[PDB]
Enzyme design. Structure first.
Site, mmCIF file in Angstrom:
data_model
loop_
_atom_site.group_PDB
_atom_site.id
_atom_site.type_symbol
_atom_site.label_atom_id
_atom_site.label_comp_id
_atom_site.label_asym_id
_atom_site.label_seq_id
_atom_site.Cartn_x
_atom_site.Cartn_y
_atom_site.Cartn_z
ATOM 1 C CE1 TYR A 141 -3.907 1.642 0.606
ATOM 2 C CE2 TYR A 141 -2.646 3.298 1.314
ATOM 3 C CZ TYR A 141 -3.952 3.226 0.851
ATOM 4 O OH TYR A 141 -5.152 4.443 0.990
ATOM 5 C CD1 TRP A 182 -1.839 7.516 -0.381
ATOM 6 C CD2 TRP A 182 -2.103 9.615 -2.053
ATOM 7 N NE1 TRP A 182 -2.936 8.512 -0.655
ATOM 8 C CE2 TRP A 182 -2.531 9.149 -1.568
ATOM 9 C CE3 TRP A 182 -1.020 10.331 -3.160
ATOM 10 C CZ2 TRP A 182 -4.179 10.333 -2.104
ATOM 11 C CZ3 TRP A 182 -2.901 11.112 -3.541
ATOM 12 C CH2 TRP A 182 -3.841 10.804 -3.322
#
Ligand SMILES: NC1=NC(=O)C2=N[C@H]3C(S)=C(S)[C@@H](COP(=O)(O)OP(=O)(O)OC[C@H]4O[C@@H](n5cnc6c(=O)[nH]c(N)nc65)[C@H](O)[C@@H]4O)O[C@H]3NC2=N1
Ligand SMILES: NC1=NC(=O)C2=N[C@H]3C(S)=C(S)[C@@H](COP(=O)(O)OP(=O)(O)OC[C@H]4O[C@@H](n5cnc6c(=O)[nH]c(N)nc65)[C@H](O)[C@@H]4O)O[C@H]3NC2=N1
Length: 766
Positions: A111, A113
């Protein structure tokens, strides 16, 4: 190199000044209506002291492999190695885990950004490599709307959270009352998942210019309150569902609600009413009952309700309130209240769950969509925030949205473009569970807490050291940008693509991974597919070399400015049904009833959380508003010159109300210890009445800096708020994280002086 080059990022489109092969300034795009001040830190992150220079291997791992002492991960004892030795080692460990344990032994959710870009998409490239290796375990959902994205499909039949909103110009003409419920769009609209167009700022300006009434419901007086001079309601955190119930009760008791919208467009209200009225539990959910839980005056609750029913009202809600225990109830109850008001599908009325994120509401163009590189495709998938549960309980069963599965037995984790040692909850629990992993590999360009805890660390490049292509505008599709190379790769850094291609070669699958193309070969293939689609769609586009030379192509708006969410449903519900079982808005859900979950009933319900401010028997006295940072994107840019504008005596700031500081003998500027039964951190205090009494604000994203990694419960010297959070699911339905369900105590720090160590590189990587 000398000159200027245009490129982009999660903070916007910019132009860079390059002086003798060094980038010296990033200037915003002249068409950006409201650039972010973080751009200066983006430039700094290329060159700061925490830039990773070379490939490194943790000494204990190099010496003993699987038999290393895993309790010293995070201590900085690294050994510098050549790229060939590092790549051989990574390929050998991938192969060994795949052959000995199977695809269930490798966790590849990774996970994060990362950075925008269709070719250099590090987490998709990681999955592309692992698929060629035999497979991996993946993650489902995200940390943003973990609960809301599961409950919306059961209530309105669609995802809803990441879908286009009624257009901003439609609101300016028709809305009379704009409500920001748990949302701070002035703060959170600075960034985008793809490149942002900052479309919310002109949209908010137009509301202010028209004199529309704005109400903000938030425990902190934020920049959104200030910008509008808005009416501000401050509930105790985690009590919003109680206020909503009290409003609903008021509309029923005064006979004001829209009985025809309820009868014709929803299902199950008859089953919800007995609960609302108190027939099932002897507890009428009145405005007075709601005041007892939330602290907001009963007369204010009734007045808000009456106002919303009598004016064209838009309920714009943010996501903090579902990032908490029982988080599914918040947006389910908001949609129930919006149904009672009866304005769903009208111009300027109803609700919206994305006006604070990535431009939601900016008019969409008629351009084509841009696609990128693909991944080539116990349980094979787990909810992302159950990663530590998974490590502690291999083989155990878990519930998730109506199904039961078993956790896989994982032995290696490979993380790129993310920072789990800052983003995941309950740091001390997590640090102990990570000993279950034989091998932990990370790629990043900055020395984050996650890079400091790996066995193998490989230096990646930034987007500014390579070429790529990306869309401008997650919802608007304003155009397509050439993200041109600004400087050559620094030190011994390599792009993730080049690292993964070389590992793939070593596993004998080099040609399948590259597909015979190079950087420009892949980028042209994505651009030609979009130009072909555009042609079908009647949208004119240049040839690739000519587009690259200009650097950008923009698209035209046709009917995008008139879009109104739910209008065709409103127009004829039998001809345009929702995706639910009944075809209508489900206030009572028979499917959730059949699941039998005690923590997620079949209609919106007030339930006590694990811990809340002033809750009966609560141990700790202050709620921590652990929300998104104003001057970072999560942990990104903490290791830059921007830190100096907000740190307090070098630590992450803690906002505290004057009365709460006075009771503890604390003054503005003091270094304080914030603690509870899970952990302890240091922060620097800023005294302000911007936070409501009983609430302290410490933003998520601070770089964890432990005093001694071998000491259980060691003090964090900088201020990572996830040292204090609990790691539990929202409920059995969604299993989302509860990163904002947090209580603690604060005291003036009286221990030994401390030296911060997280903003310089490990001694051996200098
Ligand atoms: N500058 C910036 N930095 C970022 O890191 C950033 N992250 C991006 C990400 S991934 C997303 S997912 C979004 C997050 O958007 P999201 O809506 O989840 O943002 P938060 O800052 O967690 O919370 C917004 C507001 O909720 C208030 N709040 C907290 N608890 C309560 C409560 O119980 N009740 C009420 N009524 N209000 C409460 C907070 O005080 C805060 O002002 O922002 C995105 N945009 C971002 N911008
Ligand atoms: N308590 C709490 N409250 C919250 O509100 C909260 N918010 C949650 C949310 S919604 C999310 S989205 C998560 C965010 O957690 P996330 O791990 O996504 O946070 P970032 O600081 O963006 O980490 C991204 C990393 O990727 C690196 N990186 C960038 N580009 C590249 C690249 O090209 N290659 C490589 N190899 N690396 C790259 C960056 O340098 C950075 O270290 O935090 C979650 N955690 C939260 N906790």
């Amino acid at each position: 190199a000398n000159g200027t080059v245009m490129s982009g990022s999660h903070w916007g489109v910019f132009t860079a000044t390059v002086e003798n092969g060094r980038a010296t300034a990033f200037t915003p795009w002249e068409k950006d209506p409201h650039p972010s001040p973080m751009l200066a830190g983006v430039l700094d992150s290329i060159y700061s002291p925490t830039r990773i220079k070379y490939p490194m291997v943790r000494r204990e791992f190099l010496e003993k492999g699987v038999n290393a002492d895993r309790s010293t991960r995070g201590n900085g004892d690294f050994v510098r190695v050549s790229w060939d030795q590092a790549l051989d080692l990574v390929a050998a460990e991938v192969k060994r885990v795949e052959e000995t344990y199977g695809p269930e032994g490798v966790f590849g959710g990774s996970y994060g950004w990362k950075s925008p870009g269709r070719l250099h998409n590090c987490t998709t490239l990681l999955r592309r490599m692992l698929t060629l290796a035999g497979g991996y375990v993946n993650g489902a959902g995200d940390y943003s709307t973990g609960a809301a994205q599961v409950i919306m499909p059961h209530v309105v039949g669609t995802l809803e959270v990441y879908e286009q909103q009624t257009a901003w110009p439609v609101l300016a003409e028709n809305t009379e009352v704009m409500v920001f419920w748990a949302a701070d769009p002035i703060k959170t609209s600075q960034i985008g998942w793809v490149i942002p167009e900052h479309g919310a700022y002109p949209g908010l300006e137009a509301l202010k210019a028209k004199g529309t009434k704005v109400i903000v419901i938030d425990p902190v007086r934020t920049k959104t309150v200030e910008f509008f001079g808005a009416e501000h309601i401050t509930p105790k955190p985690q009590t919003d569902v109680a206020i909503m119930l009290g409003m609903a009760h008021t509309l029923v008791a005064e006979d004001l609600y829209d009985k025809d919208f309820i009868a014709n467009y929803t299902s199950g209200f008859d089953k919800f009413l007995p609960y609302l009225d108190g027939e099932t539990d002897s507890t009428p959910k009145t405005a007075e009952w709601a005041e007892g839980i939330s602290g907001v005056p009963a007369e204010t609750i009734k007045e808000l309700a009456r106002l919303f029913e009598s004016k064209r009202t838009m309920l714009a809600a943010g996501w903090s309130m579902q990032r908490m225990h029982h988080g599914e109830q918040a947006h389910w109850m908001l949609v129930t209240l919006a149904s009672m008001l009866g304005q769903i599908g009208l111009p300027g009325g109803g609700f919206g769950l994305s006006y604070h994120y990535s431009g939601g509401g900016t008019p969409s163009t008629s351009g084509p969509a841009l696609a990128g590189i693909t991944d080539g495709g116990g349980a094979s998938v787990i909810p992302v925030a159950r990663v530590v549960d998974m490590l502690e309980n291999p083989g155990a069963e878990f519930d998730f949205n109506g199904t039961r599965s078993k956790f896989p037995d994982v032995k290696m984790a490979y993380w790129v473009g993310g920072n789990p040692f800052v983003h995941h909850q309950d740091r001390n629990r997590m640090v102990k569970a990570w000993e279950k992993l034989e091998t932990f590999v990370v790629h990043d360009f900055q020395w984050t807490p996650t890079a400091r805890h790996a066995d193998i660390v490989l230096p990646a490049t930034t987007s500014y050291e390579r070429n790529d292509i990306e869309t401008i505008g997650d919802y608007s599709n304003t155009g397509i940008l050439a993200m041109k190379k600004i400087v050559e790769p620094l030190y011994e850094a390599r792009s993730d693509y080049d690292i993964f291609a070389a590992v793939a070669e070593r596993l004998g699958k080099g040609a399948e991974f590259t597909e015979g193309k190079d950087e420009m070969g892949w980028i042209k293939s994505f651009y030609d597919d979009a130009a072909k689609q555009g042609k079908a769609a009647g949208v004119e586009m240049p040839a690739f070399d000519a587009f690259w030379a200009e650097g950008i192509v923009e698209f035209p708006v046709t009917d995008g400015a008139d879009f109104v969410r739910y209008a065709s449903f409103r127009e004829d519900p039998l001809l345009n049904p929702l995706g639910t079982p009944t075809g209508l808005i489900e206030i009572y859900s028979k499917n959730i009833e059949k699941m039998g979950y005690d923590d997620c009933p079949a209609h919106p319900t007030w339930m006590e959380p694990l811990e809340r401010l002033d809750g009966p028997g609560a141990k700790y006295p202050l709620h921590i508003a652990a929300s998104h940072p104003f001057n970072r994107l999560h942990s990104q840019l903490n290791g830059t010159v921007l830190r100096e504008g907000y740190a307090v005596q070098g630590h992450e700031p803690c906002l505290m109300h004057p009365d709460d500081a006075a009771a503890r003998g604390i003054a503005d500027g003091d270094v304080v210890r914030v603690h509870n039964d899970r952990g302890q951190i240091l922060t620097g205090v800023k005294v302000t009445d911007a936070v409501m009494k009983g609430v302290i604000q410490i933003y998520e994203g601070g770089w964890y800096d432990p005093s001694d990694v071998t000491e259980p419960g060691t003090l964090d010297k900088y201020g990572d708020v996830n040292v204090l959070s609990a790691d539990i699911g929202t409920s059995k339905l969604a299993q989302g994280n509860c990163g904002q369900t947090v209580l603690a105590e604060v005291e003036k720090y009286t221990g030994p002086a401390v030296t911060l160590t997280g903003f310089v590189a490990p001694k051996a990587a200098e």
